[PDB]
A paper describes a structure:
We have biochemically and structurally characterized a minimalist inositol phosphate kinase (i.e., TvIPK) encoded by Terrestrivirus, a nucleocytoplasmic large (“giant”) DNA virus (NCLDV). We show that TvIPK can synthesize inositol pyrophosphates from a range of scyllo- and myo-IPs, both in vitro and when expressed in yeast cells. We find a heart-shaped ligand binding pocket comprising an array of positively charged and flexible side chains, underlying the observed substrate diversity.
To gain an atomic level understanding of the ability of TvIPK to synthesize PP-IPs, we derived crystals of TvIPK17-265 in complex with ADP (1.95 Å resolution; Table EV1). For each asymmetric unit, there is one molecule of TvIPK17-265 in the C2221 space group.
Residue numbers in the entry: 48 to 263
Write the structure that this text describes.
Protein backbone atom coordinates (compact mmCIF):
# COMPACT_ATOMS: atom_id res chain seq x y z
CA UNK A 1 0.00 0.00 0.00
CA UNK A 2 1.48 3.40 1.16
CA UNK A 3 5.09 4.35 2.17
CA UNK A 4 5.11 7.34 4.65
CA UNK A 5 7.90 9.83 3.65
CA UNK A 6 10.59 10.49 6.36
CA UNK A 7 9.64 14.21 6.87
CA UNK A 8 12.24 16.18 8.94
CA UNK A 9 9.55 18.74 10.03
CA UNK A 10 6.03 20.02 9.21
CA UNK A 11 2.54 18.61 9.90
CA UNK A 12 1.13 17.61 6.46
CA UNK A 13 0.51 14.00 5.26
CA UNK A 14 3.50 13.25 2.89
CA UNK A 15 4.04 9.79 1.26
CA UNK A 16 6.33 8.37 -1.48
CA UNK A 17 4.80 8.59 -5.01
CA UNK A 18 3.62 5.42 -6.86
CA UNK A 19 6.72 5.85 -9.16
CA UNK A 20 10.40 6.76 -8.46
CA UNK A 21 11.46 10.39 -7.74
CA UNK A 22 8.01 11.73 -6.61
CA UNK A 23 6.53 12.63 -3.17
CA UNK A 24 2.77 13.34 -2.68
CA UNK A 25 1.91 16.18 -0.21
CA UNK A 26 -1.72 16.57 1.03
CA UNK A 27 -3.04 20.18 0.93
CA UNK A 28 -4.51 20.05 4.50
CA UNK A 29 -6.26 23.46 4.98
CA UNK A 30 -6.93 24.88 1.44
CA UNK A 31 -5.64 24.60 -2.19
CA UNK A 32 -3.70 27.91 -1.69
CA UNK A 33 -0.33 26.09 -2.23
CA UNK A 34 -1.60 24.91 -5.71
CA UNK A 35 -2.95 28.45 -6.54
CA UNK A 36 0.54 29.91 -5.64
CA UNK A 37 2.64 27.28 -7.60
CA UNK A 38 0.41 28.20 -10.63
CA UNK A 39 0.79 31.99 -9.97
CA UNK A 40 4.65 31.72 -9.74
CA UNK A 41 4.65 29.52 -12.95
CA UNK A 42 2.68 32.28 -14.77
CA UNK A 43 4.48 35.44 -13.43
CA UNK A 44 7.95 34.27 -12.14
CA UNK A 45 8.78 31.08 -14.15
CA UNK A 46 12.60 31.63 -13.76
CA UNK A 47 12.32 31.74 -9.90
CA UNK A 48 10.21 28.51 -10.00
CA UNK A 49 12.78 26.65 -12.21
CA UNK A 50 15.86 27.72 -10.13
CA UNK A 51 14.67 27.52 -6.47
CA UNK A 52 11.54 25.28 -6.12
CA UNK A 53 10.92 21.51 -6.48
CA UNK A 54 9.11 20.70 -9.80
CA UNK A 55 5.27 20.40 -9.45
CA UNK A 56 4.46 17.34 -11.70
CA UNK A 57 0.66 17.71 -11.22
CA UNK A 58 -2.27 17.17 -8.81
CA UNK A 59 -4.18 14.01 -7.64
CA UNK A 60 -7.37 15.23 -5.79
CA UNK A 61 -5.95 16.98 -2.63
CA UNK A 62 -2.34 15.68 -3.26
CA UNK A 63 0.49 17.66 -4.99
CA UNK A 64 2.94 15.42 -6.97
CA UNK A 65 6.34 17.08 -6.17
CA UNK A 66 9.98 16.36 -7.11
CA UNK A 67 11.58 14.30 -4.26
CA UNK A 68 14.58 16.54 -3.33
CA UNK A 69 16.29 13.55 -1.54
CA UNK A 70 15.95 11.17 -4.56
CA UNK A 71 19.51 11.10 -6.02
CA UNK A 72 21.25 10.89 -2.55
CA UNK A 73 22.70 7.62 -1.09
CA UNK A 74 22.83 9.14 2.48
CA UNK A 75 20.86 12.44 2.52
CA UNK A 76 21.13 14.89 5.48
CA UNK A 77 18.14 17.35 5.52
CA UNK A 78 17.53 20.61 7.48
CA UNK A 79 14.24 22.62 7.28
CA UNK A 80 14.74 26.36 8.03
CA UNK A 81 11.57 28.54 8.15
CA UNK A 82 12.54 31.88 6.46
CA UNK A 83 9.01 33.36 5.98
CA UNK A 84 6.93 34.92 8.83
CA UNK A 85 5.46 32.53 11.49
CA UNK A 86 1.64 32.36 12.01
CA UNK A 87 1.67 34.45 15.27
CA UNK A 88 5.06 33.91 17.11
CA UNK A 89 8.53 35.52 16.65
CA UNK A 90 11.38 33.44 15.05
CA UNK A 91 13.36 31.11 17.43
CA UNK A 92 16.69 32.41 15.90
CA UNK A 93 15.61 36.08 15.46
CA UNK A 94 15.44 36.27 11.60
CA UNK A 95 14.56 32.54 10.93
CA UNK A 96 13.51 29.30 12.79
CA UNK A 97 15.28 25.90 12.41
CA UNK A 98 12.25 23.46 12.26
CA UNK A 99 14.27 20.19 12.24
CA UNK A 100 17.27 18.30 10.76
CA UNK A 101 18.58 14.69 10.26
CA UNK A 102 19.75 13.30 13.70
CA UNK A 103 18.46 16.41 15.62
CA UNK A 104 16.93 14.11 18.35
CA UNK A 105 20.53 12.96 19.26
CA UNK A 106 21.44 16.69 19.81
CA UNK A 107 18.35 17.29 22.09
CA UNK A 108 17.08 19.85 19.49
CA UNK A 109 13.65 21.44 20.36
CA UNK A 110 11.80 23.42 17.62
CA UNK A 111 9.94 25.50 20.33
CA UNK A 112 13.20 26.64 22.11
CA UNK A 113 14.32 30.30 21.55
CA UNK A 114 18.10 30.23 20.72
CA UNK A 115 21.07 32.61 21.25
CA UNK A 116 23.33 33.32 18.18
CA UNK A 117 25.82 30.79 19.71
CA UNK A 118 23.13 28.00 20.05
CA UNK A 119 21.78 28.67 16.48
CA UNK A 120 25.35 28.29 15.06
CA UNK A 121 25.91 25.11 17.18
CA UNK A 122 22.74 23.39 15.76
CA UNK A 123 23.84 24.21 12.15
CA UNK A 124 27.31 22.75 13.10
CA UNK A 125 25.48 19.64 14.52
CA UNK A 126 23.65 19.22 11.14
CA UNK A 127 27.10 19.28 9.35
CA UNK A 128 28.73 16.58 11.64
CA UNK A 129 27.48 13.69 9.37
CA UNK A 130 29.78 15.22 6.66
CA UNK A 131 32.79 13.92 8.69
CA UNK A 132 36.31 15.35 9.17
CA UNK A 133 37.05 16.03 5.43
CA UNK A 134 37.17 19.86 5.97
CA UNK A 135 37.74 20.54 2.21
CA UNK A 136 34.56 18.67 1.05
CA UNK A 137 32.36 20.20 3.86
CA UNK A 138 33.72 23.69 2.89
CA UNK A 139 32.61 23.06 -0.77
CA UNK A 140 29.07 22.09 0.48
CA UNK A 141 28.80 25.42 2.44
CA UNK A 142 30.10 27.46 -0.57
CA UNK A 143 27.57 25.82 -3.00
CA UNK A 144 24.69 26.72 -0.57
CA UNK A 145 26.08 30.33 -0.25
CA UNK A 146 26.23 30.57 -4.10
CA UNK A 147 22.51 29.61 -4.45
CA UNK A 148 21.19 31.62 -1.39
CA UNK A 149 23.04 34.80 -2.58
CA UNK A 150 21.32 34.57 -6.02
CA UNK A 151 17.95 33.85 -4.23
CA UNK A 152 18.28 36.96 -1.94
CA UNK A 153 19.15 39.06 -5.08
CA UNK A 154 16.12 37.64 -7.05
CA UNK A 155 13.68 38.16 -4.08
CA UNK A 156 13.97 42.02 -4.43
CA UNK A 157 11.89 41.77 -7.70
CA UNK A 158 9.16 39.34 -6.39
CA UNK A 159 5.86 40.82 -5.05
CA UNK A 160 4.85 37.90 -2.78
CA UNK A 161 4.64 37.74 1.04
CA UNK A 162 6.48 34.41 1.62
CA UNK A 163 4.64 33.64 4.95
CA UNK A 164 5.55 30.13 6.25
CA UNK A 165 8.11 29.18 3.50
CA UNK A 166 11.12 26.96 4.40
CA UNK A 167 14.61 26.38 2.90
CA UNK A 168 15.36 22.60 2.61
CA UNK A 169 19.19 22.16 2.84
CA UNK A 170 20.41 18.67 1.68
CA UNK A 171 23.96 17.18 1.51
CA UNK A 172 25.17 13.55 1.11
CA UNK A 173 27.31 11.98 3.94
CA UNK A 174 30.25 11.82 1.42
CA UNK A 175 29.68 15.58 0.55
CA UNK A 176 29.76 14.68 -3.23
CA UNK A 177 26.34 16.42 -3.72
CA UNK A 178 24.20 19.18 -2.10
CA UNK A 179 21.37 21.66 -2.84
CA UNK A 180 18.94 24.08 -1.16
CA UNK A 181 15.39 24.84 -2.38
CA UNK A 182 12.27 26.82 -1.21
CA UNK A 183 9.14 24.78 -0.19
CA UNK A 184 5.71 25.22 1.51
CA UNK A 185 3.63 27.89 -0.35
CA UNK A 186 0.49 27.06 1.76
CA UNK A 187 0.34 30.56 3.44
CA UNK A 188 1.99 32.70 0.65
CA UNK A 189 0.01 35.89 -0.31
CA UNK A 190 0.04 38.44 -3.21
CA UNK A 191 1.32 41.96 -2.22
CA UNK A 192 2.46 45.13 -4.11
CA UNK A 193 6.08 45.20 -2.68
CA UNK A 194 8.93 42.67 -2.09
CA UNK A 195 9.22 40.71 1.25
CA UNK A 196 12.02 42.43 3.28
CA UNK A 197 11.50 39.99 6.26
CA UNK A 198 12.23 36.91 4.06
CA UNK A 199 15.24 38.72 2.45
CA UNK A 200 16.65 39.44 5.99
CA UNK A 201 16.28 35.69 6.85
CA UNK A 202 18.35 34.63 3.75
CA UNK A 203 21.11 37.32 4.20
CA UNK A 204 21.41 36.28 7.91
CA UNK A 205 21.89 32.57 6.88
CA UNK A 206 24.49 33.67 4.23
CA UNK A 207 26.41 35.51 7.03
CA UNK A 208 26.32 32.42 9.34
CA UNK A 209 27.32 29.94 6.55
CA UNK A 210 30.14 32.28 5.29
CA UNK A 211 31.58 32.42 8.87
CA UNK A 212 31.50 28.56 9.03
CA UNK A 213 33.14 28.27 5.53
CA UNK A 214 36.00 30.62 6.58
CA UNK A 215 36.44 29.46 10.19
CA UNK A 216 39.61 27.43 10.88
N1 LIG B 1 9.91 18.36 -2.42
C1 LIG B 1 10.35 17.82 -1.29
N2 LIG B 1 11.33 16.89 -1.35
C2 LIG B 1 11.76 16.34 -0.21
N3 LIG B 1 11.34 16.55 1.04
C3 LIG B 1 10.36 17.47 1.07
C4 LIG B 1 9.82 18.13 -0.02
N4 LIG B 1 8.82 18.99 0.39
C5 LIG B 1 8.76 18.83 1.69
N5 LIG B 1 9.68 17.93 2.17
C6 LIG B 1 9.86 17.47 3.55
O1 LIG B 1 8.63 17.67 4.23
C7 LIG B 1 8.80 18.59 5.34
C8 LIG B 1 7.60 19.50 5.41
O2 LIG B 1 7.42 20.18 4.14
P1 LIG B 1 6.47 21.47 4.03
O3 LIG B 1 6.19 21.78 2.60
O4 LIG B 1 7.03 22.56 4.89
O5 LIG B 1 5.13 20.90 4.69
P2 LIG B 1 4.22 21.47 5.88
O6 LIG B 1 3.15 22.31 5.21
O7 LIG B 1 3.66 20.25 6.56
O8 LIG B 1 5.10 22.29 6.79
C9 LIG B 1 10.15 19.27 5.09
O9 LIG B 1 10.76 19.61 6.33
C10 LIG B 1 10.94 18.18 4.36
O10 LIG B 1 11.53 17.26 5.26
MG1 LIG C 1 6.59 23.79 6.31
MG1 LIG D 1 16.11 21.93 -8.61
Amino acid sequence: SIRIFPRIAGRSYIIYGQTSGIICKRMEKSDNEFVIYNYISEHYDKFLKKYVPKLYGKNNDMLLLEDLTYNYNNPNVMDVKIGARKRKSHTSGFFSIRGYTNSHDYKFDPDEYLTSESTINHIKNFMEAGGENRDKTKQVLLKWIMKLSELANDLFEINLKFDGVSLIFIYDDDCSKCDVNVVDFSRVKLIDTNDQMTISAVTNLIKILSELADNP
